[PDB]
Amino acid sequence: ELSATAQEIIKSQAIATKKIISDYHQQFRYKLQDFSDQLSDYYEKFIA
Amino acid sequence: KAASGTTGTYQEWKDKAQNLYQELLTQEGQASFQGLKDNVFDGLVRVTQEFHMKVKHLIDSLIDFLNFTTEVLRNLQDLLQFIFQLIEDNIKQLKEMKFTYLINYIQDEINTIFSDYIPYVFKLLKENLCLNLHKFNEFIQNELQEAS
């Protein structure tokens, strides 16, 4: 019983552990895209 | 993998634990030690006989070595042989009157006493309490009558 309980607990933990990283990586990339877009208009905003 | 291995090892070792439980029950029954006592007594008798022979040989050789006292040495040899025979008799006796029985006897006695005599002692205390209380009532009634 103890072995089964431990196995199911670790299985439950693993999915959420992966889920967090999966959520965060895409936003990590979108931030790079946003920053690259921002750099384009720096000179124009400055001059204007 | 670690959990599987641990469970396997535990289940493997569960059997020898129960074998040891049976051995412990046998030991508490005191039925596996008397043989060791018999073996050690037999070894003691054998060693005593061998040493008897060696000592008498030593005395006999010493007599000739000195001659190379006599009556005293021969009497001492006879007395030492007598003491060796006494020692052998005592060893045989000790083998005969082994102590293994009283251990099991006292074990059974305590096991019986705990479950049998203790409630009776409690009942004795309860009965004595009630009797003393009633006697107290009687005596105070008499004393109060006298005081009145």
Curated annotation (Swiss-Prot), chain A:
Annotated localization? Cytoplasm; Secreted; Lipid droplet
Indicate the segments annotated as coiled coil, or none if absent. Answer: none
Q: What induces it?
A: Up-regulated in response to enterovirus 71 (EV71) infection (at protein level).
> What does the record say about PTM?
Palmitoylated; structural requirement for proper assembly of the hydrophobic core of the lipoprotein particle.
Q: What does this protein do?
A: Apolipoprotein B is a major protein constituent of chylomicrons (apo B-48), LDL (apo B-100) and VLDL (apo B-100). Apo B-100 functions as a recognition signal for the cellular binding and internalization of LDL particles by the apoB/E receptor.
Subunit and interaction comment: Interacts with PCSK9. Interacts with MTTP. Interacts with AUP1. Interacts with CIDEB.
Annotated disease: Hypobetalipoproteinemia, familial, 1: A disorder of lipid metabolism characterized by less than 5th percentile age- and sex-specific levels of low density lipoproteins, and dietary fat malabsorption. Clinical presentation may vary from no symptoms to severe gastrointestinal and neurological dysfunction similar to abetalipoproteinemia. Hypercholesterolemia, familial, 2: A form of hypercholesterolemia, a disorder of lipoprotein metabolism characterized by elevated serum low-density lipoprotein (LDL) cholesterol levels, which result in excess deposition of cholesterol in tissues and leads to xanthelasma, xanthomas, accelerated atherosclerosis and increased risk of premature coronary heart disease. FHCL2 inheritance is autosomal dominant.
Q: What is this protein called?
A: Apolipoprotein B-100
Q: Which organism is it from?
A: Homo sapiens (Human)
Swiss-Prot record, chain B:
Inducing or repressing factors: Up-regulated in response to enterovirus 71 (EV71) infection (at protein level).
Q: Can you say where in the cell this protein is located?
A: Cytoplasm; Secreted; Lipid droplet
Reported modifications of this chain = Palmitoylated; structural requirement for proper assembly of the hydrophobic core of the lipoprotein particle.
Q: Which residues form a coiled coil?
A: none
Q: Which disease is it linked to?
A: Hypobetalipoproteinemia, familial, 1: A disorder of lipid metabolism characterized by less than 5th percentile age- and sex-specific levels of low density lipoproteins, and dietary fat malabsorption. Clinical presentation may vary from no symptoms to severe gastrointestinal and neurological dysfunction similar to abetalipoproteinemia.
Binding partners and assembly: Interacts with PCSK9. Interacts with MTTP. Interacts with AUP1. Interacts with CIDEB.
So what does this one do? Apolipoprotein B is a major protein constituent of chylomicrons (apo B-48), LDL (apo B-100) and VLDL (apo B-100). Apo B-100 functions as a recognition signal for the cellular binding and internalization of LDL particles by the apoB/E receptor.
Spell out the protein name for this chain: Apolipoprotein B-100
Q: Which organism is it from?
A: Homo sapiens
- Gene that encodes the chain: APOB
What stretch of the parent protein is included here? Answer: 4132 to 4371 of 4563
